[PDB]
Structure formats: C-alpha cells, structure tokens
C-alpha cells in the first residue's frame, strides 16, 4: 500500500489550485514546528559546539531550522500567487 493520497477540492481554477496545496503545505510545516519532537528520525555532517561542549547541530535543530526554511519560502511563494495574502505574524519578507 502506497499510502492516503493529497486530494485537492475539484471546481478550483488554476491559480486557486496551486494557492490550495501550498496553503496546506504552510499549515503542515507549522503543525510540525508546533507539535511532535523533531528530534526523532525522519545523513549525518560532522558535530558542531558552543564553548561548553554542546552540541548546536542535532537532528532535532537541523530539521527544525529546515522546515522553518521551507514554511519561509511557501509563504513568499504564496504571496506571489496571491496578492490577497496576509502573511503571518511572525514572517520577515
């Protein structure tokens, strides 16, 4: 079984079309930052300290600084896409 399949709502126009999944796609990067440890699997770059010996490059700050990235650039495509846009709060264009 290759999984559930993405289904985008029929009766949409192009634009709306890509405007629908890149907005689904926001709310999934933010559902992430927001909820679950990021620490856990989904390779490996060489370590990373502070002065201390603490390691600052981890999975769990790697993936976390990555999907931040991505949230990033979907909400710059989006206001591409869609001048009616509002992007959020916390977002620096």
Same mark, same amino acid.
């Given at each position: ?7 985008? $709502? #029929? ?15 926001? /709310?999934?990067? &933010? @559902? +992430? ?8 699997? $989904? #390779? ?15 999975? /769990?700050?790697? &993936? @976390? +600084? ?28």
């Amino acid at each position: 079984i290759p999984g559930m399949p993405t289904v985008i $709502p #029929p009766g949409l126009t192009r634009e709306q079309e890509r405007a629908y999944i890149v907005q689904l796609q926001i /709310e999934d990067l &933010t @559902r +992430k930052l927001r909820t679950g440890d990021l620490g856990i699997p $989904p #390779p490996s770059p060489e370590p990373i300290y502070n002065s201390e010996g603490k390691r600052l490059n981890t999975r /769990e700050f790697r &993936t @976390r +600084k990555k999907l931040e990235e991505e949230r990033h650039n979907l909400i710059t495509e989006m206001v591409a896409l869609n001048p009616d846009f509002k992007p959020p709060a916390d977002y620096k264009p």
